[PDB]
Each structure stands twice: as structure tokens, then as C-alpha cells.
Design an enzyme around this catalytic site. Structure first.
Site, PDB file in Angstrom:
ATOM      1  N   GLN A   1       0.805  -1.198   0.000  1.00 23.08           N
ATOM      2  CA  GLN A   1       0.000   0.000   0.000  1.00 23.08           C
ATOM      3  C   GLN A   1       0.847   1.261   0.000  1.00 23.08           C
ATOM      4  O   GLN A   1       0.321   2.351  -0.386  1.00 23.08           O
ATOM      5  CB  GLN A   1      -0.990  -0.013   1.153  1.00 23.08           C
ATOM      6  CG  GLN A   1      -1.824  -1.271   1.136  1.00 23.08           C
ATOM      7  CD  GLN A   1      -2.826  -1.352   2.230  1.00 23.08           C
ATOM      8  OE1 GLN A   1      -2.618  -2.119   3.180  1.00 23.08           O
ATOM      9  NE2 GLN A   1      -3.911  -0.565   2.146  1.00 23.08           N
TER      10      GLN A   1
ATOM     11  N   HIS B 190       1.317  -9.492   4.304  1.00 18.25           N
ATOM     12  CA  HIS B 190       0.232  -8.571   4.407  1.00 18.25           C
ATOM     13  C   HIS B 190      -0.381  -8.533   3.046  1.00 18.25           C
ATOM     14  O   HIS B 190      -0.124  -7.653   2.257  1.00 18.25           O
ATOM     15  CB  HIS B 190       0.692  -7.172   4.864  1.00 18.25           C
ATOM     16  CG  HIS B 190      -0.439  -6.299   5.360  1.00 18.25           C
ATOM     17  ND1 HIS B 190      -0.453  -5.712   6.606  1.00 18.25           N
ATOM     18  CD2 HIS B 190      -1.610  -5.940   4.776  1.00 18.25           C
ATOM     19  CE1 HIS B 190      -1.555  -5.001   6.756  1.00 18.25           C
ATOM     20  NE2 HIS B 190      -2.269  -5.109   5.654  1.00 18.25           N
TER      21      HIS B 190
ATOM     22  N   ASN C  49      -1.454 -11.262   8.037  1.00 19.06           N
ATOM     23  CA  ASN C  49      -2.458 -10.190   8.197  1.00 19.06           C
ATOM     24  C   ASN C  49      -3.841 -10.673   7.745  1.00 19.06           C
ATOM     25  O   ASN C  49      -3.999 -11.108   6.607  1.00 19.06           O
ATOM     26  CB  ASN C  49      -2.108  -8.931   7.387  1.00 19.06           C
ATOM     27  CG  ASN C  49      -3.077  -7.780   7.667  1.00 19.06           C
ATOM     28  OD1 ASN C  49      -3.041  -7.088   8.718  1.00 19.06           O
ATOM     29  ND2 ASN C  49      -3.986  -7.623   6.762  1.00 19.06           N
ATOM     30  N   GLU C  50      -4.809 -10.660   8.661  1.00 14.68           N
ATOM     31  CA  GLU C  50      -6.213 -10.861   8.310  1.00 14.68           C
ATOM     32  C   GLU C  50      -6.571 -12.044   7.450  1.00 14.68           C
ATOM     33  O   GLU C  50      -7.288 -11.928   6.491  1.00 14.68           O
ATOM     34  CB  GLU C  50      -6.847  -9.567   7.710  1.00 14.68           C
ATOM     35  CG  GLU C  50      -6.835  -8.470   8.751  1.00 14.68           C
ATOM     36  CD  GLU C  50      -7.345  -7.143   8.167  1.00 14.68           C
ATOM     37  OE1 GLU C  50      -7.713  -7.098   6.989  1.00 14.68           O
ATOM     38  OE2 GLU C  50      -7.443  -6.197   8.923  1.00 14.68           O
TER      39      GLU C  50
END
Lengths: 417, 407
Positions: free
Chosen positions: B17, B111, B155-156
């Protein structure tokens, strides 16, 4: 003294060969294909991408006055039409490092490796390549053009015509499918193998025209930003000779590889000459010739006399100033590289003492590096790199040549101005 | 304070990101496909890859004591089995910068973004994926493990299940071919679409087992280097609520998305909780915001009380320490963000005060950045970046939270 004060003394690199992680390039892609002719992957190379500051400071400390390196299109336009200002800023910091160390930067806009996406539009035979290249060159100039000393548009457009005479390459387009590497390439590109044409393998009339137009359109793009900035391309011009039975083959090769490109250079500010030895043809084509005196590392003849001969040829045929943009020797014994360079520099001085406008001498290569399909085996560097730690250790050849450069500068006291 | 002496105060980013030029990643590839769902390419993002030093000085200057960021598998292992020591040294320098500025680094080992090559072997349904991921985590530890303050494996993993409950992905694998982006991904990779499974879209039983196995094998690889280093994964845990009619739906989502993953977390040193708001289910499934304030940039209800709820939930189900590894607000008006962070942070302190062992608060996100399929529209950053110049400008929320840390 036959060398003028502004004569450039440099070492050269090419981005794919030193930077590391050129993961968007065509060459990278070719290195990892099942049928590949690349002996090993480039991977990190010498990590010049992150270490350029210390590399420049090392080079400038050795007494060099110039540094030739590529900007990598694979990094600058990573997908068609999406330019990376982040990568352009990387190369601006490289040029700023050169300038903080007094080095004139000789920037090669293209050095074989292309963005991988270009290979989907026919590569170096595609009709859009000339203008996409030129657009690309304008974008680099837009961002850092003020900082470039000298521009080389394309590296060795004629190389594959010389390799064909061996010939490694130059299958007909309609036959590229039968070499594994190309078949695979096309498959994953989703394209026909006859249409796969990276720069350094393309010896086709399409490829000649595309290279020339790209050179022409890039020169114009560059001149639009800096009309004062000298531009040329560089040529893989060997000293072509024959033995009996090879006279006509030698002549054909000298004509198609050397003279045709030099004729095509006649509008330019300078031409870059890149020469390592002689190339000899007999009745069965290429003869690694009669033996003495290399023993290079590849088992080729050590013949730095070639340089003087190709400089003379270039002056004669093209009639424009020459810069020696590559010259060197593949050897594991640096004392041979020292003796080679002494002779090559003599070759240069001899041309200059004859009124030939030679504008610099740039040794291939700064650091032992990725020698394309032969990988890390061949050692061309004036500076050693232990790739495991990335530590640099200059060889005697770097000190010799570096110090020769330094010892051509005037020595006067300050004068009111 | 009820904040202990060594509570982490951070901001967080993800490499895809913020870094720019993540050209070898699966996401990069998906951004440029003909029928893509990504509104725009990530391109340069905020060029954090090159500016990290300045970014970390700024972060630290504002008062934060910790920085959460990813290391990108796509750069560390660019072809299967070919590790880049130069990419590892880059990240080594990022960690050295953190420590030089006094910031405890919290490293996310993955991520969402994966190397593109991983997608050719079935991605996060691939049965070799756990052992590849573990091997990768090992190489990173071998190069730089001694500089990591806390480790987040994954991540998630549970995000795409939550999205499925909104009907937003979760096609059976046999139907992946029916989504244009997957059909295009498939064709370019030479693979069947049923096989295409990037991490954040994969809510399948196979992807559950593969994610879990990767987390466990990674944890073991990281402890082989640093048995003292605290390891966990982070969860996309919303405060799942109902209105009359929505009870079974809400319980279902609560069980498959939050509790199943918290249960799976029971052996770990901590679980990272990532929460933004409540998700409300009525008789007709997922409910839109009420005539109830604010709302956020995406039209979701501004609901900082969510965080207290998900912390309490995690303590109850997982029973291990909690780190808030993401919290924040998508908004163009930062005054809303300040008020949100104030209440969220009060929520955390209220948990602390009840004896729940919370180890950190890390806000999403340092810099306005590439919000995946929504591109640069959504503004989650505590610090603005004019991407044209890459100039950083801290918002009020940066100085608020930084200063809150500083006490």
C-alpha cells in the site's frame, strides 16, 4: 600530450548486469524459462541499485573522470503507459552522486534489457517500439535530463548481426518456434513465437528499421530537452579479418555489422565504439583463429590492437567524433588486463595523434558482474566483488587506468578569473 | 495511566500500500488485468521503499514508540527458491532506522501481497504454501531477526470470510472462472481459474487449513531464531451485531469469521486485533447505516466503540494478550478522525482497567495510501501525502495520537 583536457576516462556498467532485482525485465524472464540458454540467474548481481553511492565514490577516488551506466526502462515504465517517478528519482540520485564526485555521467538509455511487456507488441521488431522508446526517453529527460553529461540511446544494435555470423542466433522469424527458449517465451506471453524479439537477438530487417527509427526518434526526444547535449548510439564493431577462403564472408560481415551501422550514424554528435578483439573468418565462417596470445578466459585471442583498427574504421566510414564506450578483457589474471589496457590506451593515443576526434575511453567493466548467458563465470571487472558479502576490492587495472586518467589533468596554480 | 510502562503506541503500514513498485507481487499483476476489480494501479504508492528513513524520523518525531510494517515476500523471494539478499538488506536498513529512532518494530511477514509465482502453484490453497511460507520467514529471520521487536505472521486471514457475508467474494472454486478478473488471471498464468487463490480473496476450507498451517509453521520458524520474540497473527474482527431478524445470521458470521480464528489463536503469544466499526445484520442480511450520524468516507457508520467490543471478545475466546494492530477511520475530515481515535483509545484503556492484557495500540495508517481495490480515494492516514510530489503533511490526528503516546 595527445589527450585533450576534456577527454573522458571512465568505466561502464549496464543495469541488468550490476543492479540486481531487474525483475520486470525481459532478460530476467528469459533467465527463468524452462528452455533457457542463460547458464544462471542474475538475481542480486552486485546490488549496484542500493550501493551506487559508495561505488561512485570508489570509482571517482581511483581517478576516473566519467561513469557510464544504464537507465532501465523495465524500472521506469513498469507497465505500458505507467511511468514510475519513484524509479526516475532513483536515477536522479545516481546522477547527483556522479556530479558530487565530479564524474561526467554517460547515460545509456537502453542496454539490451527491456520491460517484459514490450515483448507482447513484437519487441524490437514492433512498429510502436520506436515511439514508445522515444516517449520513454522524453520522460527520463523531463525528470533528470539536466544532469546527464552524454547520452547513448541504444547499446550495440548490431550485436546480433555479428552473433548470427557465428551464429548463435538469427533464425528466421518463421522459425523462432523451434528454439525451446522462444517457444516458452511466446507461450507465457500469450503470443506467437515468430513475434518474440528481445533487442540483442533480433537481426532482421524489421529489427534494423525499428532500431534505427528508435535511435532517430530518441535523439529528437532528447534534443527537445537539451539541444546542447551530445547523443549517439554504440556499436559492437569488431576488427574483422580473414584467412584464405574467408575473404568474402569477412567482407559481408564487415559490411552488414560494421559499415551499415556506421553509415546510419552519420547525422550523430558522436558514435560509441565497443571493441574487444579481432574476429576472423575462414572458408567455414568464424575461426577462433591461430592461437597465440590469449588465452583470454573464454579461450578467445587477446588482441587489444583491434580497438585502434575499429576507431580508424569508424572515423573513415561515419566521419564523426568517436567515443570508446566499451573496451576490456575477460581474464582471471589481472596482470593480463593491465597489459591489455596499456595497449588499448596506446591505440587511442595513436588515433588522436593522427587527428581522429576521439572523446573518451571507457573500460568495460567497473565490477565483475553478470555476463549475460555465461553468468558470473566471465570476469571483465577492473574491480572485484565478493558477491556473498558484496564487498568491492579494486584490482591493479583499476588503479593503473584510474591513475593514468588523473595523470592527464593540467597542474596550474589558481589564476584571477 | 492504566497503560503499562511498555505499551506500544504505533502507526502501521503494508508494503504493497505504501512502498511503490511492488511489481513482482500478485496484486500488482491483478491491478493490470483487463477485467480487474482494482479501480486503479498502485504504481509508486507513496514511495516508502525509498523514503523510509524520513518517514520513520517523522513518525518518531511525532511521539510514536513503535512502527508496524510488512516485509514483502514478492521482493525477498522473487522466483521460487531464489532469495534476494539485497531485498533482505533493504529491510534490515528499515529496522536499523526504526531502532536508531527509538521505535519498536512490529513486522508483518505477509500482508496480503504474495510473489506472483506463488499464484501458479495454487496460492493460498496450495499445499506446499505452508512450508514455502515458513522457509521464507526463516530467511528473513536469518538476515534480520535480531532487530524485530514483535512479529505478526499473517495479516487478516479471515477478511475474505467477512466480505463473503456481504456477498462480496467467496465463489466456489469451480466458479472462479466466471469472474472476469480470475479468468484473465488464469489465462495469463497458463492455469485453470479454479486454482487462482490470492490470500485476501480465499475464504475456502482449503484456504483456512493452508493459512492456519502457514501461521503455525511460520511461528515455529521464527522461534527457532528468536524463542523470546512474541509472535501472533492479526484478525479482521468487526463488532458483529444484530437487529431483530438478524440473530442467526449475526451469530453465524461471529462464529465463522471471529471466533473460529480466535480459537485457532489459542496457542500464540498474542493476537493482533484489527477493528474499525460494527457490522450489523438484519432479517435481510447486512444492514446499511441507520439515520445515525457521521458517516465514514465509505458510508459505514462511525463507530469507535467497536474496538472495546472486539478486544473483550478476543480476551474471552482466545484468552491471550491482545495487541491492537489496526484501528482508524476513512475520512476527508480529520476532526472526525481525532474524535474517533480519542474514543477508541478510551475503549482500550477501559479494557486495560478491567485487567485485560492489551499490549499495544497501532493506528491504521501512517500515510494516506493505496486502499486496495478502491485505489487512492479512501483516506485512512494520520499523515497526508501529496503523491505528485511525495511531500508528507501530518494531520492533526498524527499530532494528537503521537502526543497522547508521549504521555
Amino acid at each position: 600530450n595527445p589527450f585533450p583536457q576534456d577527454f573522458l576516462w571512465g568505466v561502464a556498467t549496464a543495469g541488468h548486469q550490476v543492479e540486481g532485482n531487474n525483475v520486470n525485465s525481459d532478460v530476467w524472464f528469459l533467465e527463468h524459462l524452462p528452455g533457457t540458454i542463460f547458464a544462471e540467474p542474475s538475481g542480486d548481481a552486485v546490488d549496484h541499485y542500493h550501493r551506487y553511492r559508495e561505488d561512485i565514490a570508489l570509482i571517482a577516488g581511483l581517478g576516473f573522470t566519467s561513469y557510464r551506466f544504464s537507465v532501465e526502462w523495465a524500472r521506469i515504465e513498469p507497465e505500458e503507459g505507467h511511468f514510475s517517478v519513484a524509479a526516475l528519482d532513483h536515477y536522479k540520485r545516481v546522477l547527483e552522486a556522479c556530479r558530487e564526485h565530479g564524474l561526467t555521467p554517460v547515460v545509456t538509455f537502453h542496454h539490451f534489457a527491456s520491460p517484459l511487456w514490450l515483448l507482447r507488441s513484437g519487441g524490437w521488431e514492433g512498429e510502436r517500439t520506436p515511439e514508445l522508446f522515444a516517449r520513454y526517453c522524453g520522460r527520463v529527460m523531463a525528470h533528470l535530463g539536466d544532469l546527464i553529461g552524454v547520452a547513448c540511446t541504444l547499446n550495440e544494435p548490431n550485436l546480433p548481426w555479428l552473433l548470427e555470423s557465428f551464429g548463435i542466433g538469427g533464425e528466421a522469424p518463421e522459425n523462432r518456434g523451434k528454439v525451446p527458449m522462444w517457444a516458452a517465451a511466446a507461450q507465457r506471453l500469450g503470443v506467437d513465437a515468430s513475434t518474440v524479439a528481445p533487442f540483442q537477438f533480433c537481426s532482421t530487417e524489421a529489427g534494423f528499421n525499428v532500431k534505427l527509427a528508435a535511435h532517430k526518434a530518441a535523439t529528437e526526444a532528447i534534443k527537445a530537452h537539451r539541444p546542447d547535449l551530445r547523443v549517439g548510439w554504440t556499436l559492437a564493431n569488431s576488427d574483422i579479418q580473414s584467412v584464405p577462403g574467408g575473404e568474402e564472408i569477412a567482407a559481408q560481415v564487415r559490411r552488414d555489422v560494421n559499415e551499415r551501422f556506421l553509415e546510419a550514424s552519420r547525422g550523430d554528435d558522436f558514435v560509441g565504439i565497443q571493441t574487444y578483439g579481432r574476429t576472423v573468418y575462414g572458408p567455414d565462417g568464424h575461426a577462433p583463429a591461430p592461437e597465440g596470445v590469449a588465452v583470454n578466459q573464454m579461450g578467445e585471442e587477446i588482441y587489444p590492437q583491434a580497438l585502434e583498427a575499429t576507431i580508424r574504421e569508424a572515423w573513415r566510414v561515419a566521419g564523426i567524433p568517436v567515443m570508446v564506450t566499451e573496451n576490456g578483457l575477460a581474464t582471471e589474471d589481472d596482470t593480463q588486463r593491465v597489459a591489455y589496457l596499456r595497449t588499448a590506451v596506446d591505440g587511442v593515443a595513436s588515433c588522436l595523434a593522427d587527428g581522429i576526434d576521439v572523446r573518451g575511453y571507457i573500460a568495460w567493466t567497473a565490477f565483475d558482474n553478470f555476463e549475460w548467458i555465461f553468468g558470473y563465470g566471465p570476469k571483465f571487472g577492473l574491480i572485484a566483488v565478493d558477491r556473498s558479502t558484496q564487498e568491492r576490492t579494486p584490482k591493479e587495472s583499476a588503479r593503473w587506468l584510474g591513475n593514468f586518467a588523473r595523470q592527464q589533468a593540467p597542474a596550474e596554480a589558481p589564476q584571477p578569473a
